[PDB]
């Protein structure tokens, strides 16, 4: 199985993908680490082809909101953080209502 072409992540792509990893279960509740965030970016990249520059959350301390509108996952400290699904992210660009610099 070859490795599919590169293509940028997109809102619709991000959303379908979130429901996918939510339907599958596992990423939900998982403890965060760069090594994991990175294994993620690569697994998605290998399978889907989305260039690895989309899974960026915001700077802490506290909740880490995703910069990519449509990626329905955030990082919540439970500092020691963990992945948490929250569909409101698909309707509120909180990571821009907060940190507008990045946009």
């Amino acid at each position: 199985t070859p490795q599919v072409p590169l293509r940028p992540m997109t809102y619709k792509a991000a959303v379908d993908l979130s429901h996918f990893l939510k339907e599958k279960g596992g990423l939900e509740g998982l403890i965060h680490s760069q090594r994991r965030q990175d294994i993620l970016d690569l697994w998605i990249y290998h399978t889907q082809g989305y260039f690895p520059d989309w899974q960026n959350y915001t700077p802490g301390p506290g909740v880490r909101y995703p910069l990519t509108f449509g990626w329905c996952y955030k990082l919540v400290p439970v500092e020691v953080l963990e992945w948490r699904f929250d569909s409101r992210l698909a309707f509120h660009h909180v990571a821009r209502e907060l940190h507008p610099e990045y946009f």
């Binding site: 070859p2 072409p5 293509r7 619709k12 399978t47």
Partner: protein, 57 residues
């Protein structure tokens, strides 16, 4: 000018097209990237497929 699948591919976004090695297609729009919008000769369904996964008949 209608391509055939070299390898199987399961899509994971509503806009991609899934297919089994041998499923024939017909490109509707190659001029936009290495992700071609194609039409399945089998089902009639359209969607983006990874051009590196197909080749002409």
């Amino acid at each position: 000018t209608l391509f055939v699948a070299l390898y199987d591919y399961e899509a994971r976004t509503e806009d991609d097209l899934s297919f089994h090695k041998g499923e024939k297609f017909q490109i509707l729009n190659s001029s936009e990237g290495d992700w071609w919008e194609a039409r399945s000769l089998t089902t009639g369904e359209t969607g983006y497929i990874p051009s590196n996964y197909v080749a002409p008949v």
